[PDB]
Design a protein around this nucleic acid. Structure first.
Ligand SMILES: [Mg+2]
Ligand SMILES: [Zn+2]
Lengths: 251, 1316, 81, 66, 237
DNA sequence: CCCTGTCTGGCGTCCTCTCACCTATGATCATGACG
DNA sequence: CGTCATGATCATATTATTACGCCAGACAGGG
């Protein structure tokens, strides 16, 4: 990675491989020009310890470091634990077509719908709007449609009301504890910059309104819209899966 | 009497306890510690002189050369604070040191050096502290925070219960040096005694007692008493003192003097001990089985054979008695090894020892230190003398020697920094005494065992580490060169010293970035007692007890102001009156209650002196003399509260505000809030934001003026006098003559700090609050700062609140606000963003900043000038061009997508050599013109003050009333006047005037040099353009507002004016809260604050009514006097009969928007006083007005509570959190979207959300949620084509990060594949 | 190990007159070697060494297609293999 | 116990996504152990349908065509 | 502390009383912090040990299930039979004490009407089919699980019940905490279980067993009191 | 070989936001000035 | 014209410990 300062603060792996190749080339040269009897041994010890620093740093006695106290990262520190490929990149991923803001009340909602801003609904639902523009014939190519929805002209709000209409979104509170923590709503466009969320539903999220933040996701494909309508809609989950108590208790 | 800014708006003050010690200067920890650090300090310690006299003289490797120390000196900084923050340099001062080199001769190191050389040398740059208590490291104002750590000295801990799973407690005795090797004595379940050094391998403890050259006979002489057996004609008689027999069952019938004393099968009672010591029984008779297991003390040798009869510390058998009996020994010395009294811990320890003399012990210690190498007697002596017994590698401080003498019951608190033999032997004696059952262990969290480091001591330690590295270099270049030809600047180099101190002030765990968006946040971030950092504990490891308030935090560390979350109780905040002791502990004031009378002398107690005495509580009633009016008074004796008698008390608290900190003493009615809600209220009061026009608190605590003046945001007058010229830029004070120097004629100029960027992107402004011609006193505010008003502290604004449920829009914690609030522009905060653009140096050539730019037209370039940089004043949108930049390819700086603003300030810095373009020359001419005008006005204004002094002197003694203004004004000296003090004073003013002339010449030349020169910059950058956008963010549904008690809330709907519940007068309420947050979240103080705020506004409305009708000053005097008396025995006692009919009109001009009321923390306004003040206004007594509705126009039943609450806007806004992403950039190593908001990123669909979608039957939603939308690149381009063509369908593929998992597992020796 | 490897009285005597070969080294700057470039407009590829200058420059082997033009460079200028 | 019952599986990807990855991958490396994606979390790793909801009908179809 | 806080929040609190309140409050906050730190890891380990168990058949075809009786600590009956045998398929078909008369067949889901008909006849112990005693290889059949919780009908073939089970156990882990004779109340018949008793000289019944459990059978069949009886205790009955 | 103590390996919540920081020191070579 | 001094540019890895805690399973100590 460049740090935009004329220098490369390198990753730890290139440092480790560079140490192994330095030590290995010096050992090839020392086996070339003959080792002094009981001498071709210290260099092989150094090579073994450099490879043991590369494959799993810190498992052998005291680990190495580049700067300054922190031990640098080997391969087994990229597979294991947190900050590794199993728990940070493969089981939970960062996801396109998503957004997040601060929640609020708005009690004029039916319980299968939530308020969602015009700016968030315009930025989540961009390629739907592109498809409706070049399907109705208001832009020739994709670039004219992109510049139309960047300027936000007076026709794309009608396009946006024609793409929101029967299309669920997934609302998500950030510590998801049980399976009612992800639910699916049908959006209503709001002038403003917050997510208006039905009050009874906030019994299941364990969410007050003292600065809580919720994240919305969009189901792209068709089967995911049917799963966010038949399986995950806010009217269906009125009973908890822990017991038979209703979760729509008026608070 | 009152100061003149205290006759502007005198705050009404409830409160009953008459104060005796005012609030000290709140920034005394930082300033006093760093003043202790850097100052010319004789008699050795403390300061830099301690390091320079402990690491010097560097003497060489037997080359008879020596680099000794003389003195040091800091020159002036090249840059003052403002130029340093603008440009970006450290605010440092060069540390010149006078070092001396001496070089001894041959055969006489006690002989004469042939040559010396003493000279000045440059080393390091230590950063100075500004007057606010902060450092400027790289243009960013940073604070070093005090650390709370363990006090050096002995410490007798007890590893209770958990070890060995049998309840047998251990006891360890950690000696904690200030610098050097640790030392832990402990036990084991076999009751052996084990030493260890720096948590290494374990040895039996007496191996170090042989290492101090003790024979075993002397060791048993120290650690045990003696039992004497005399062989006198019958059964080997015994000397017996019966105190050892207290509860022991004898094995025979103890008789003496022909009298049976003790029977066999019974124990010796205490009265039998009294019988035996009253009859003075000395010699008793023992059987042959009594000395069957008695342990001998010293070695007995047979005189004939020359052999050893029995070794030392050995039990005696029949044959050993038979050997020593026939050798000629009549005295036998043994030891007393009881079950309860004295265990044989030393004896079992010596039986586990394999060693036998000093040499073997030193070999074993040298072998446990450095494993597996040949020891030598010289190497073992050198190591064991350099562990504990050398001035170099081991040093208790004075704090360490005090705790080490105090916890061993010594007398002298002075000693050497190194240990000795008596010290370790007293540690082992006290450990054996604690194991025996007498004496107590020491807890950890007790604040007599927690020292407070600060900026000075930590900077001294880092500077000392830099000096030991440089002595590791000088011991190099000193005995490996030719002498005499070198000077002591070729040897010592400034790289490790400056690297060490620059790394500490630059990036440490305690040198942290100052949370600066509020005067309160500054003055409570500088007063912080952090437990973390180097030498302390860590957050994710410890623990339970250290996150808990000990009984001795009372009046030292605040109990209620601490950050909730992962570190509660580790980021403690220091209290109000809490100083720091001479050694580093905490101390707090008290009042010496002599036998009857509370004497008004203050008297500082530490944390261990508080425990022995008995302290009366702060609010105890006393009748005008000090006599306690009750005969049972609530006190606390030894960490435990109780009820004591009237005149067994020894101290009383000073004031009732001293348990709390300055964060949580601005909360009115603190005693009514539950402690959780007071914690959340203090923390959110720290997190406020400055509004556009900050008002005042109607219900304060009187602590606002200490927090405002004792911080550094207001412009406090230095010398009092008369104002001469007020302006939005500057303020000129003419100094009064009874405060004024004879020379340096003197009228002061305060250059205020106008609109500039804070660290939290707020707008640190200063507004002048004085009129013209106005008197000001010494120690008084002239210019209000951010969130100040007339010298008070106004964080948020005070608004009309009602507690009622209103149609669901305030459901959980939400807040509902009228449009009358946003129309008045009263939360409209002003933010400033800094946007930088560098001109780097790459291949194909350098870059271009000029406006001849491809791919753009008129509509972009109309807002730029002819040289790329945007104008000053051009109001831009989100996504225009500010700086046009093209590389050998458009890379112009743009406003980031979303923010508006108005460009207020443009800086251009040029690396020297590069051609300045036309706008950089425009800024250079501009700043030349500004600095030229400013220094010329300095000369003109101070010359005007000097000529006014000449006119003031020439009033008498040869006065010329007409002849004075006929001649030009620069010659007012050669007029008719003899040799007096006046011609002497005119000569001194001529000296001052010619000094100002030549000083103005040289300073204007230096300022032209500073403007004209280039600046040292990054490697390979041409010029840096910085542009300051100034957004004005108003309020909207989604911001966070909160009061001062923990009542948070997202504002949920900004209603119109008409819908608000109004009352039967006509006025709409501004904010409708929710009542249901009160009985669960027990913050009942906000309702008393609401009622007292309504009382304050009732008095303000009556003043507005009595003044709008143009009434004469008599009725205003009547009503203001009635509103200022109104209470019990209070402290205020003002009278308006000494305000003289013009101040009363101006005081009523300041009271007409409400009357400010002080309510101190635990001595506040009771309920009956609020009722009597609500009766003075014509408001209802219960505080509740009946309110109509805005929609229906018909009355709400059961009348509701209205009043004024002082609510704060927090800077968790909603157009800083809101974010959305369709398709942006993707990361490089794993093809997933980036993280964050500045990087246009997507929200983490974490692991528990994957579990929650497995928990439904949603399968396609999860498949596209982790294959199509996230990772698979061909899958997502197929998806994007399919979405813009209307075909909702996914082609799945494989995550590319799983292929990264295959490459990382495959890059090992592991062969992972994919079958079939 | 804790102490230095037990050095017997044999290798010491064997290392009393070693280096009986020639230049050898790590095969860097010699008569018929390879060396990659690092600076100049003729960099990006590799080159060969022959007779260098000494206390000034060296000898770069620049060639494209079927022609070659020598360009003396100091070894700092190039990238010693 | 549940951490030992989850580390002792016939599927090394589940026991690798749980606690210590070094011991699980070395034991499955020298044993030549062969996962067959066996349930939910391995299919969350590899990027295909969960065999729980709608993917359960898909997996019955896929296993019936084996 | 032996001297309590005699002041409420409507009146004032002086300095020491507020300090003692601060002891309590900061102890509570540190409990909540480290409590969340343990609770999240408990949910992780449970959803990683279950992780895999999918309702993969429709009838295993066994009989052996567990016995559901109402729990009796020794006071009031804490959890009754309706709240334990709600919606779970019976193991052996329950015969009312009109023996050889079937009340429910042996594969009937016990919804609310059947639970009321269990409460009326005062049924002793409805032996019921549990997940732990199933027979399905590589999964769990549908009848041994029970009602689809959060819905009304029987469980659908497929819903991953290991994950919803592990979340339902670990989700209230935020709420949890971290750091002479036998006296009867009701009236009924007297039952003894696992007792070796004998007659004393006084005419009473004395016990020669530690394993004695006393029970109070009520008027209709079930038990409302149970008492562990020690070794060598002396009964008056 | 049968305990019983020691040792060293594992593990210790989620999501988001902000900020700084990411060398300097020594040696060698070249150029300029002075003798 | 030559030598010396000063300034600028380019080049590599200690420089000469202590304040978590539990569980668990293997490795080894004692008997
Ligand atoms: Mg909340
Ligand atoms: Zn079954």
């Amino acid at each position: 990675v460049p740090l935009d300062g004329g220098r490369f603060a390198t990753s730890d792996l290139n440092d480790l491989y560079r140490r192994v190749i330095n030590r290995n080339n010096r050992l090839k040269r020392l086996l070339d020009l003959a080792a002094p009897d009981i001498i071709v041994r210290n260099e092989k010890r150094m090579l073994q310890e450099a490879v043991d620093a590369l494959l799993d740093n810190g498992r052998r006695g005291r680990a190495i470091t580049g700067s300054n106290k922190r031990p640098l990262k080997s391969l087994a520190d990229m597979i294991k634990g947190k900050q590794g490929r199993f728990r940070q990149n493969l089981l939970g991923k960062r996801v396109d077509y998503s957004g997040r803001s601060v929640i609020t009340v708005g009690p004029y909602l039916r319980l299968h719908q939530c308020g969602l801003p015009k700016k968030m609904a315009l930025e989540l639902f961009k390629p739907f709007i592109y498809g409706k523009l070049e399907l109705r014939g208001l832009a020739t190519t994709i670039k004219a449609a992109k510049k139309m929805v960047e300027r936000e002209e007076a026709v794309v709000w009608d396009i946006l009301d024609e793409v929101i209409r029967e299309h669920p979104v997934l609302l998500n509170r950030a510590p998801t504890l049980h399976r009612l923590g992800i639910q699916a709503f049908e959006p209503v466009l709001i002038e403003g910059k917050a997510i208006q969320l039905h009050p009874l539903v906030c019994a299941a999220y364990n969410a007050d309104f003292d600065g809580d933040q919720m994240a919305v996701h969009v189901p792209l494909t068709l089967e995911a819209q049917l799963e966010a309508r038949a399986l995950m809609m806010s009217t269906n989950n009125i009973l908890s899966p822990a017991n038979g108590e209703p979760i729509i208790v008026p608070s | 009497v009152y100061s003149y800014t205290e006759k502007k708006r005198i705050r009404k003050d409830f409160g009953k306890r008459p104060q005796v010690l005012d609030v000290p200067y709140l920034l005394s920890i930082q300033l006093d510690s760093f003043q202790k650090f850097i100052e010319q300090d004789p008699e050795g310690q403390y300061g830099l002189e301690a390091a320079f006299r402990s690491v010097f003289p560097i003497q060489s490797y037997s080359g008879n050369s020596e680099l000794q120390y003389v003195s040091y000196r800091l020159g002036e900084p090249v840059f003052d604070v403002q130029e340093c923050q603008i440009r970006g340099v450290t605010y440092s001062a060069p540390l010149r040191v006078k070092l001396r080199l001496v070089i001894y001769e041959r055969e006489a190191p006690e002989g004469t050096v042939k040559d010396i050389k003493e000279q000045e040398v440059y080393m390091g740059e230590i950063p100075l502290m500004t007057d606010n208590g902060t450092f400027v490291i790289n243009g960013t104002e940073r604070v070093i925070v005090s650390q709370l750590h363990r006090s050096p000295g002995v410490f007798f801990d007890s590893d209770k219960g958990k070890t060995h799973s049998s309840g047998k407690v251990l006891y360890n005795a950690r000696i904690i040096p200030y610098r050097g090797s640790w030392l832990d004595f402990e036990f084991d379940p076999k009751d052996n005694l084990f030493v260890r050094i720096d948590r290494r391998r374990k040895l039996p403890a007496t191996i170090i007692l042989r290492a101090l050259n003790y024979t075993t006979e002397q060791i048993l002489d120290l650690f045990f008493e003696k039992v004497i057996f005399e062989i006198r004609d019958n059964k080997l008689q015994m000397e017996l003192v019966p105190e050892r027999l207290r509860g022991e069952t004898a094995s025979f019938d103890i008789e003496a003097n022909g009298k049976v004393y003790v029977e066999k099968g019974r124990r010796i009672t205490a009265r039998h001990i009294r019988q035996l010591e009253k009859d003075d029984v000395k010699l008793i008779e023992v059987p042959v089985e009594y000395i069957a297991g008695k342990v001998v003390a010293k070695d007995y040798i047979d005189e004939s054979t020359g052999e050893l009869i029995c070794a030392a510390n050995m039990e005696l058998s029949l044959d050993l008695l038979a050997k020593l009996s026939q050798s000629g020994h009549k005295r036998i010395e043994t030891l007393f090894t009881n079950d309860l009294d004295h265990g044989p811990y030393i004896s079992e320890t010596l039986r586990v020892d394999p060693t036998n003399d000093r040499l073997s012990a030193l070999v074993e210690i040298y072998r446990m230190m450095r494993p597996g190498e040949p020891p030598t007697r010289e190497a073992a002596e050198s190591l064991f003398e350099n562990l504990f017994f050398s001035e170099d590698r081991y040093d208790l401080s004075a704090v360490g020697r005090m705790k080490f003498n105090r916890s061993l019951l010594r007398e002298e608190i002075e000693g050497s920094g190194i240990l000795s033999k008596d010290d370790i032997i007293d540690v082992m004696k006290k450990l054996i005494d604690i194991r025996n059952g007498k004496g107590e262990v020491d807890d950890i969290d007790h604040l007599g065992n927690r020292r407070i480091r600060s900026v000075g001591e930590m900077a001294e330690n880092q500077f000392r580490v830099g000096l030991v590295r440089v002595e590791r270099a000088v011991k190099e270049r000193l005995s490996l060169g030719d002498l005499d030809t070198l000077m002591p600047q070729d040897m010592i180099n400034a790289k490790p010293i400056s690297a060490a101190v620059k790394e500490f002030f630059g990036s440490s765990q305690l040198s942290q970035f100052m949370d600066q968006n509020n005067p309160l946040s500054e003055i409570t971030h500088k007063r912080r007692i952090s437990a973390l950092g180097p030498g302390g504990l860590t957050r994710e490891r410890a623990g339970f007890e250290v996150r808990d308030v000990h009984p001795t935090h009372y009046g030292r560390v605040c109990p209620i102001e601490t950050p909730e979350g992962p570190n509660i109780g580790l980021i403690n905040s220091l209290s109000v009156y809490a100083q720091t002791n001479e050694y580093g502990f905490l101390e707090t004031p008290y009042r010496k209650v002599t036998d009857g009378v509370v004497t008004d002398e203050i008297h500082y107690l530490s944390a261990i002196e508080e425990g022995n005495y008995v302290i009366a509580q702060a609010n105890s009633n006393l009748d005008e003399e000090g006599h306690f009016v009750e005969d049972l008074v609530t006190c606390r004796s030894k960490g435990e509260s109780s009820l004591f008698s009237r005149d067994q008390v020894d101290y009383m608290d000073v004031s009732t505000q001293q348990v709390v900190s300055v964060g949580a003493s601005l909360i009115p009615f603190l005693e009514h809030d539950d402690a959780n809600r007071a914690l959340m209220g203090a923390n959110m009061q720290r997190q406020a934001v400055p509004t556009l026009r900050a008002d005042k608190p109607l219900v304060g605590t009187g602590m606002e003026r200490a927090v405002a003046v004792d911080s550094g945001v207001t412009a406090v007058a230095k010398r009092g006098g008369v104002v001469q010229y007020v302006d939005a830029s500057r303020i000129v004070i003419k100094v009064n003559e009874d405060e004024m120097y004879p020379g340096e004629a003197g009228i002061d100029i305060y250059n205020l700090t106008k609109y500039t960027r804070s660290n939290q992107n707020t707008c640190i402004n200063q507004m002048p609050c004085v009129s013209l011609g106005e008197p000001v006193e010494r120690g008084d505010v002239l210019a209000d700062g951010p969130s100040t008003d007339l010298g008070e502290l106004a964080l948020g604004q005070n608004m009309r609140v009602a507690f009622m449920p209103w149609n669901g829009y305030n459901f959980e914690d939400s807040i509902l606000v009228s449009e009358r609030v946003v129309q008045e522009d009263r939360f409209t905060t002003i933010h400033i963003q800094e946007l930088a653009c560098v001109s780097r140096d790459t291949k194909l050539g350098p870059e271009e900043i000029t406006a001849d730019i491809p791919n753009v037209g008129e509509a972009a370039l109309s807002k730029l000038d002819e040289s790329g940089i945007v104008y000053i004043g051009a109001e831009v949108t989100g996504g225009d061009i500010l700086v046009g930049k093209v590389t050998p390819k458009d890379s112009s700086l743009r406003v980031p997508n979303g923010v508006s603003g108005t460009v207020i300030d443009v800086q251009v810095f040029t690396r020297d050599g590069v051609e300045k373009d036309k706008r950089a020359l425009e800024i250079e001419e501009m700043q030349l013109k500004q600095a030229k005008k400013d220094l010329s006005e300095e000369l003109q204004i101070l010359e005007a003050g000097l000529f006014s002094r000449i006119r003031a002197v020439l009033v008498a003694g040869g006065v010329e009333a007409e002849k004075l203004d006929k001649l030009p004004r620069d010659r007012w000296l050669e007029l008719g006047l003899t040799d007096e003090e006046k011609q002497n004073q005119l000569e001194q003013l001529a000296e001052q005037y010619d000094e100002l002339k030549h000083e103005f010449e040289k300073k204007l030349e230096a300022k032209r040099r500073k403007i004209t020169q280039g600046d040292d910059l990054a490697p390979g950058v041409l010029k840096i353009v910085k542009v300051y956008l100034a957004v004005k963010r108003r309020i909207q549904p989604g911001d966070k507002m909160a009061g001062r008690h923990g009542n948070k809330g997202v504002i949920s709907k900004i209603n119109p004016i008409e819908d608000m519940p109004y009352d039967e007068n006509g006025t709409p309420v501004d904010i409708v809260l929710n009542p249901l947050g009160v009985p669960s979240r027990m913050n009942i103080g906000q309702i008393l604050e609401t009622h007292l705020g309504m009382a304050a506004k009732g008095i303000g409305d009556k003043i507005n009514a009595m003044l709008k009708q143009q009434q004469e000053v008599a009725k205003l005097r009547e009503f203001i006097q009635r509103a200022y008396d109104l209470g019990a025995d209070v402290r205020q006692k003002v009278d308006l009969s000494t305000f003289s009919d013009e101040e009363v009109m101006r005081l009523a001009e300041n009271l007409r928007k409400g009357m400010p009321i002080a309510t101190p923390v635990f001595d506040g306004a009771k309920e009956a006083e609020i009722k009597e003040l609500l009766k003075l206004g014509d408001l209802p007594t219960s505080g509740q007005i009946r309110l109509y509705d805005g929609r229906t126009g018909e009355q709400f039943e059961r009348p509701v509570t209205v009043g004024y609450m002082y609510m704060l806007k927090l800077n968790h806004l909603v157009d800083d959190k809101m974010h959305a992403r369709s398709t942006g950039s993707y990361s490089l190593v794993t093809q997933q979207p980036l993280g964050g908001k500045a990087q246009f990123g997507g929200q983490r669909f974490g692991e528990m959300e994957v579990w929650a979608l497995e928990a439904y039957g949603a399968a396609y939603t999860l498949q596209e949620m982790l294959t199509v939308k996230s990772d698979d690149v061909n899958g997502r381009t197929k998806m994007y084509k399919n979405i813009v063509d209307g075909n909702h369908q996914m082609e799945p593929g494989m995550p590319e990060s799983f292929n990264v998992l295959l490459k990382e597992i495959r890059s090992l020796g592991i062969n992972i594949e994919l079958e079939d | 190990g804790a102490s230095p490897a037990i050095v017997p009285s044999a290798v010491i005597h064997q290392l009393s007159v070693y280096k009986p070969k020639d230049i050898v080294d790590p095969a860097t700057p010699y008569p018929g070697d390879k060396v990659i470039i690092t600076e100049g407009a003729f960099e990006g590829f590799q080159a060969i060494f022959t007779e260098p200058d000494g206390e000034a420059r060296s000898m770069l082997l620049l060639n494209l297609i079927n022609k070659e033009i020598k360009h003396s460079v100091k070894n700092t200028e190039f990238r010693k293999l | 116990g549940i951490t030992k019952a989850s580390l002792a599986t016939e599927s090394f990807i589940s026991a690798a996504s749980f606690q210590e990855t070094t011991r699980v991958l070395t034991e499955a490396a020298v044993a030549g152990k062969r996962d067959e994606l066996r349930g939910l979390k391995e299919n969350v790793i590899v990027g295909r349908l969960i065999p729980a909801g709608t993917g359960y009908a898909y997996h019955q179809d896929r296993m019936r065509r084996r | 502390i032996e001297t309590p806080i005699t002041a409420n929040f409507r009146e004032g609190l002086n300095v020491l009383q507020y300090f003692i309140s601060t002891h309590g409050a900061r102890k509570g906050l540190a409990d909540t912090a480290l409590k969340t730190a343990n609770s999240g890891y408990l949910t992780r380990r449970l959803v990683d040990v279950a992780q895999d168990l999918v309702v993969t058949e429709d009838d295993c075809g066994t009989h052996e299930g567990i016995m559901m009786t109402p729990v009796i600590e020794g006071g009031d009956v804490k959890e009754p039979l309706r709240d334990r045998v709600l919606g779970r398929v019976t193991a052996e078909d329950v015969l009312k004490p009109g023996t050889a008369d079937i009340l429910v067949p042996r594969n009937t889901l016990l919804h609310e009407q059947w639970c009321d008909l269990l409460e009326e006849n005062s049924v002793d112990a409805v032996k019921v089919r549990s997940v732990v005693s199933c027979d399905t290889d590589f999964g769990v059949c549908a009848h041994c699980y029970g009602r689809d919780l959060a819905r009304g009908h029987i469980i659908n073939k497929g819903e991953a019940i290991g994950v919803i089970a592990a979340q339902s156990i670990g989700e209230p882990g935020t709420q949890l905490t971290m750091r002479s004779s036998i006296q009867v109340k009701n009236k009924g018949s007297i039952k003894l279980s696992n007792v070796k008793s004998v007659v004393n000289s006084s005419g009473k019944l004395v016990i020669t067993s530690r394993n004695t459990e006393l029970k109070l059978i009520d008027e209709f069949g079930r038990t409302k009191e149970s008492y562990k009886v020690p070794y060598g205790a002396v009964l008056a009955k």
